[PDB]
């Protein structure tokens, strides 16, 4: 029976969006940050807010948090352990290009290319669904 109410959750999302750069993984430090930055009128409410702040922020890193949108910021956190393309997606060899592509392809002046090979056109049609 530990469901946080809208008060604790909304306060947590507003605190992160305004002060992302101070709050961290440690509960005790960002308890003290939330204490200072937010004039919260009770100690049990401060602890529950601080508690949920170091749950939201401990999942911002993992990725797709919905309610809180520092959007380019989550994107720039995504851009840290980057697997950047040295040779990017479509820098490749001969391309599979449908013999019926090749009739619509020489409907221009293109008949061929270095990395164009014309494979085999489609055989048979198992496509529709019996009407039962």
């Amino acid at each position: 029976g530990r469901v946080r109410t809208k008060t604790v959750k909304k306060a947590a999302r507003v605190i992160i969006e305004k002060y992302y750069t101070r709050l961290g993984n440690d509960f005790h430090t960002n308890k003290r940050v939330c204490e200072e930055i937010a004039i919260i009128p009770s100690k049990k409410l401060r602890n529950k807010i601080a508690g949920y702040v170091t749950h939201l922020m401990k999942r911002i890193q993992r990725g797709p948090v919905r309610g809180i949108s520092i959007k380019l910021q989550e994107e720039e956190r995504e851009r840290r352990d980057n697997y950047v393309p040295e040779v990017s997606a479509l820098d490749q060899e001969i391309i599979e290009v449908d013999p019926d592509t090749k009739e619509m392809l020489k409907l221009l002046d293109f008949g061929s290319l270095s990395n164009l090979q014309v494979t085999q056109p489609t055989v048979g049609m198992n496509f529709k669904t019996p009407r039962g």
Binding site: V97, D98, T101, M104, L105, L108, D109, F110, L113, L116
Partner: peptide
């Protein structure tokens, strides 16, 4: 349409 865009379209499967 210049001498690239068609092969780009027909590779992507836009047609």
């Amino acid at each position: 349409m210049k001498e690239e865009d068609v092969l780009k379209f027909l590779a992507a499967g836009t047609h």
